Design a protein around this ligand. Structure first.
Ligand SMILES: *[C@@H]1O[C@H](CO)[C@@H](O[C@@H]2O[C@H](CO)[C@@H](O[C@@H]3O[C@H](CO)[C@@H](O)[C@H](O)[C@@H]3O)[C@H](O)[C@H]2NC(C)=O)[C@H](O)[C@H]1NC(C)=O
Ligand SMILES: *[C@@H]1O[C@H](CO[C@@H]2O[C@@H](C)[C@@H](O)[C@@H](O)[C@@H]2O)[C@@H](O[C@@H]2O[C@H](CO)[C@@H](O)[C@H](O)[C@H]2NC(C)=O)[C@H](O)[C@H]1NC(C)=O
Ligand SMILES: *[C@@H]1O[C@H](CO)[C@@H](O[C@@H]2O[C@H](CO)[C@@H](O)[C@H](O)[C@H]2NC(C)=O)[C@H](O)[C@H]1NC(C)=O
Ligand code: A1IPC
Ligand code: NAG
Ligand code: NAG
Ligand code: CL
Ligand code: CL
Ligand code: CL
Length: 843
């Protein structure tokens, strides 16, 4: 009975340090590890639930689950209801609930899956129908379902699993007895720690390159434990088991299927894809204006100027000081006059210490009962930047109305273009409240997940504090998401155009409302390298508008680190350089001339690619696609890609291989089977890498980042500007990467860059580009006033093996072309319109 292979032992003492006698008294097996692996584990006969009265419904199954022997946890729920819903051919959904009490809940034709059930011990078994592979099997360990402890386990199909944000780790999670804690926490990113957000989703790869995803729709503090058998255990401190399985079979299909439940990514405004520049320490409008002046003087693109806490009066939301920021409104109006936008920090917590009637956000918040309350029904008071603060309850419909009013009234004073919502874990400088927290089972639960500080109260507010929908215990992991939703709506009402919200704290489904940055990353080579997996991970989780602080936030960047970080950072979907109060300056213009040139080239290339990046965001928004994606999403059948997380793709076609280490003049990266053209051969070293699926060492001097364009793809480009206001007026270009057989395909999505309801109203242009048999044509999917008059002036064709004798545009010899026999590049001058059918030919 105790003859269980070490890697298959499930922990029977997750709650406490246990002796052999206590372990055996629990009905568990005690076998010390020979050097982590649990010493106290469940025998196969450990009491679980028994399935009874399984019955077939329309859309699936229902059953009773009965536990006859209590666990070592208090308040086992001995009778459960199982509901299985076969929702689509790709999506299976099951719940396990208490039928006697409403518990907290987060607010050939055949399916790809088959489901069967173990009776005793109870388990759900999900097979992939096509190849019989076991994807889910919850029979592997007991089902625990107590008031403050849920545990469901499964076998995994492989050692390859990704998800369960937010943590600083490789894209592929370690299955070596790893405890991953989901409890939103203000902490500078470091490995093994619960960070700002919680995404209870994983994607599991299968031998051969198929994949499936599992979402547990549970917002409680949880541990997810991975062991090398391989297997996973969800361990939640409340709510219910609400489980979705997504059958893929392609990894990109798993992600889209997940996003079909939690929401497709919001469409950002075009300007939001430009360069953002911020620090804590721009302590006046004069200094802030000098940042824009200095960037402009040195020909550095900048779409958006930001301020941190500097702008506020005594670090309070919806104020500006009358010292350095007396003329704040004029500053922002002037930014708009120059074609730039403005962003500023907003904290959730509201100063509670001001004289009554002197600070409207608090005074009005008190009147309308917007704040999280304590045992006596008064506002819970903590400490953040302004001192004593109350915390808005963004589950309260009246708090939403209050937040809309405060944002709209402040926007009437200072016409900011979005909100940078920080400290929204929610972060508390003291433990729970100024008054501490009561002694109850929510504050002191029977199972505390592996959170930093060892308590649910650490760096946040009391768990038993009251919100409109439930206790903070159940809602904590949603706090940031609820603020992001409230802020999205507030910005839609205030401005009447697409909202731009960048949030620190997140939850599953965040990407439907807002973007994210990875928080207080050190200015280190390690954090530069760690940013690639984390940006890729957020893309898999439907938050494609993500990036890290370019050059790092904490400490002092070096010039070499800031060159490499700007080079990589230019391929973050959200690109912002941000810097701490105590740091040396790190604006592009603050470095040596050669570092400035490298940084200017990185920004120039990003601005040139913006029509492509915007089209990739359109695909995320309409089809649940990733923007930044790991190689394994695009080449899943090549198992060499599975562990690659220091390279990224933009969409299907652009491979970025950054230097992530000091003192390097070369980088080794994986090239999937195919031809990869060096983007340096496109007017804005091997001209083409011919790969069989192999590692290639590339030259990568300090002034260089390796970027390759996949053969078979066409990229739309636009001319330069220091803003997207300027760049969107420039003529466009195509980069056409031919296959050996002379084929390529690409597309362009164009709209006005900021209106709401564009796709519903049809207020966009959509064009497909096709290369075939020495011709390039456009195919007009939709042509409207927005995009019709886009000028195409240049067509660069890569992989043209012989010099053409003639190049025609609509049947007429072109004004000029150049052909380079060394690089096999054909560069063609044209005068065409994206929205009018053209034919470019050569021979
Ligand atoms: C629920 O939250 C409220 C605040 O909204 C807490 O009120 C606080 O209660 C303490 C006493 O328990 C007050 O401390 C007292 O302050 C006065 C001076 O103002 C001092 O003379 C007393 O010796 C004592 O320190 C505190 O002022 C008050 N805070 C505010 C903002 O009024 C309440 O205690 C919370 N309830 C629980 C059970 O946590
Ligand atoms: C499993 O179900 C049986 C039978 O339940 C009946 O039929 C169902 C379709 C549904 O309509 C129920 O409401 C019916 O009662 C349960 O056994 C019955 O228990 C009830 C109440 O204790 C009793 O009145 C009947 O005599 C029993 N009927 C039979 C045929 O034995 C049984 O309790 C269910 N098991 C569990 C664990 O819930
Ligand atoms: C799902 O997991 C269960 C438990 O690990 C597997 O059931 C065991 O199968 C082994 C080998 O066939 C038997 O010797 C054990 O007696 C079974 N245990 C129990 C509790 O039934 C089961 O095979 C797995 N199902 C699938 C389809 O893989
Ligand atoms: C110099 C110490 C820096 C650490 C504190 C930063 C506090 C706050 N959080 C940052 C964003 O995560 C932001 O820049 C600042 O307002
Ligand atoms: C802008 O550049 C000037 C001239 O080099 C410098 O004195 C000033 O401090 C800079 N200001 C900022 C905010 O970088
Ligand atoms: C960064 O540089 C400044 C100036 O030399 C210094 O005071 C500060 O401590 C440095 N920061 C770190 C973390 O070394
Ligand atoms: Cl012992
Ligand atoms: Cl509740
Ligand atoms: Cl390999």
């Amino acid at each position: 009975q105790c003859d269980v292979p070490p890697n298959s032992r499930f922990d029977c003492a997750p709650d406490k340090a246990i002796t052999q006698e206590q372990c055996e008294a629990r009905g568990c097996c005690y076998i010390p590890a020979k050097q982590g692996q649990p010493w106290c584990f469940f025998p196969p006969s450990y009491p679980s639930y028994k399935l009874e009265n399984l019955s077939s419904s329309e859309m699936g199954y229902t059953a009773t689950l009965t536990r006859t022997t209590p666990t070592f946890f208090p308040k086992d729920i001995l009778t459960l209801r199982l509901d299985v819903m076969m929702e689509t051919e790709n999506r299976l959904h099951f719940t396990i609930k208490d039928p006697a009490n409403r518990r907290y809940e987060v607010p050939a034709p055949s399916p790809l899956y088959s489901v069967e059930f173990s009776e005793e011990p109870f388990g759900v078994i999900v097979h992939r129908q096509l190849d019989g592979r076991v994807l889910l099997n919850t029979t592997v360990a007991p089902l625990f379902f107590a008031d403050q402890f849920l545990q469901l386990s499964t076998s995994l199909p492989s050692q390859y699993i990704t998800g369960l944000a937010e943590h600083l780790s490789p894209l592929m999670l370690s299955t070596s007895w790893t405890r991953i804690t989901l409890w939103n926490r203000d902490l500078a990113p470091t490995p093994g720690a619960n960070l700002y957000g919680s995404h209870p989703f994983y994607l599991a790869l299968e031998d051969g390159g198929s994949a499936h995803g599992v979402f547990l729709l549970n917002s409680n503090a949880m541990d997810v434990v991975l062991q090398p058998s391989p297997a996973l255990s969800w361990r939640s401190t409340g709510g219910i088991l609400d489980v979705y399985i997504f059958l893929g079979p392609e990894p990109k299909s798993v992600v889209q299927q997940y996003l079909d439940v939690v929401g497709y990514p919001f469409m950002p405004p075009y300007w939001g894809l430009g360069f953002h520049l911020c620090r804590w320490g721009y302590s006046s409008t004069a200094i802030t204006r000098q940042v824009v002046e200095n960037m402009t003087r040195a020909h550095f693109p900048l779409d958006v100027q930001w301020n941190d806490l500097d702008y506020m009066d005594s670090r309070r939301d919806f104020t500006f000081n009358k010292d350095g920021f007396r003329d704040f409104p004029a500053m922002v109006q002037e930014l708009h006059q120059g074609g730039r936008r403005y962003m500023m920090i907003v904290d959730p917590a509201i100063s509670s210490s001001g004289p009554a009637g002197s600070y409207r956000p608090y005074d009005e918040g008190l009147r309308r009962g917007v704040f999280i309350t304590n045992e006596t029904g008064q506002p819970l008071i903590g400490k953040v930047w302004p001192g004593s603060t109350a915390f808005p309850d963004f589950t309260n419909p009246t708090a939403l109305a209050w937040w809309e009013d405060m944002v709209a009234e402040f926007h009437d004073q200072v016409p900011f273009d979005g909100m940078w919502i920080d400290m929204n874990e929610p972060s508390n400088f003291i433990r729970g409240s100024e008054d501490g927290c009561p002694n109850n089972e929510l504050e002191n639960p029977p199972y505390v997940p592996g959170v930093v500080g060892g308590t649910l109260q650490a760096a946040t507010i009391c768990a038993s504090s009251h919100q409109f929908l439930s206790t903070h215990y159940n809602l904590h992991n949603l706090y940031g998401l609820t603020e992001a939703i409230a802020s999205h709506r507030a910005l839609v009402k205030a401005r009447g155009t697409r909202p731009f919200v960048i949030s620190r704290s997140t939850f599953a489904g965040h990407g439907r409302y807002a973007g994210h940055w990875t928080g207080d990353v050190w200015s280190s080579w390690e954090q530069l390298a760690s940013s690639v997996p984390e940006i890729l991970q957020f893309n898999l989780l439907g938050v494609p508008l993500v990036g890290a602080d370019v050059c790092g936030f904490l400490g002092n960047t070096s010039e070499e680190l800031c060159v490499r970080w700007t080079q990589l950072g230019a391929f973050y979907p959200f690109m912002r350089n941000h810097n701490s109060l105590l740091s040396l300056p790190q604006e592009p213009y603050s470095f040596s001339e050669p570092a400035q040139q490298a940084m200017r080239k990185a920004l120039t290339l990003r601005y040139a690619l913006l029509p492509h990046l915007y089209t990739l965001f359109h695909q995320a928004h309409v089809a649940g696609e990733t923007v930044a994606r790991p190689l394994f999403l695009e080449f899943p059948k090549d198992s060499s890609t599975w562990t690659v997380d220091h390279q990224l793709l933009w969409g299907e076609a652009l491979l970025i291989t950054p230097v992530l280490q000091a003192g390097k003049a070369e980088v080794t990266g994986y090239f999937p089977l195919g031809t990869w053209y060096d983007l340096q051969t496109v007017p804005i070293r091997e001209p083409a890498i011919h790969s069989e699926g192999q590692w290639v060492t590339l030259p990568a001097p300090l002034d260089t980042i390796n970027v390759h364009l996949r053969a078979g793809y066409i990229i739309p480009l636009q001319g330069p500007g220091l803003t997207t206001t300027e760049s969107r007026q420039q003529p466009m270009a195509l980069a056409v990467a031919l296959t050996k057989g002379g084929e390529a395909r690409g597309e362009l999505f164009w709209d006005d860059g900021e209106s709401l309801e564009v796709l519903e109203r049809g207020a966009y242009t959509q064009v497909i580009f096709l290369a075939r048999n020495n011709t390039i044509v456009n195919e007009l999917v939709r042509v409207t006033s927005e995009g019709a008059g886009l000028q195409l002036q240049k067509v660069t064709v890569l992989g043209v093996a012989t010099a053409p004798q003639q190049v025609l545009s609509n049947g007429v010899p072109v004004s000029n072309f150049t052909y380079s026999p060394d690089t096999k590049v054909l560069d063609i001058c044209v005068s065409l319109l994206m929205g009018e059918q053209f034919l470019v030919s050569w021979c």
